[PDB]
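Q: Please design a sequence for this.
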């Protein structure tokens, strides 16, 4: 289905809340392709479970910040955002909806 921010039959991995993107890091289309990324970055090494052991939630945070990274400034990922929540973006933003999503489920 094309319901934004809803759990689809294909979206079964992470928590499909593309709506939380801006809230994930505190950025959304206000920043350039520069700051949107910075926003994710300062969280990425911040919330990295490698740096924060015994914290599975940190991995979880690292996983949502992993997502919002592209979407906010990237029209393509924001386009997937309207279709796929965190799942489609998790794969499309990091590798590309065209190549890997067509390979996964």
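A: Design:
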């Amino acid at each position: 289905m094309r319901s934004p921010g809803m759990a689809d039959q294909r979206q079964r991995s992470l928590s499909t809340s593309g709506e939380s993107l801006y809230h994930v890091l505190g950025l959304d289309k206000n920043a350039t392709s520069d700051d949107i990324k910075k926003s994710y970055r300062k969280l990425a090494l911040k919330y990295h479970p490698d740096k924060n052991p015994d914290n599975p939630e940190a991995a979880d945070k690292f996983k949502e910040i992993n997502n919002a990274h592209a979407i906010l400034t990237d029209a393509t990922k924001r386009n997937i955002y309207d279709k796929y929540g965190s799942l489609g973006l998790y794969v499309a933003e990091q590798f590309g909806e065209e190549n890997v999503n067509t390979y996964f489920v």
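Q: Thanks. Anything notable?
A: The two ends are 14 Å apart (CA to CA). The chain has five helices and no strands.
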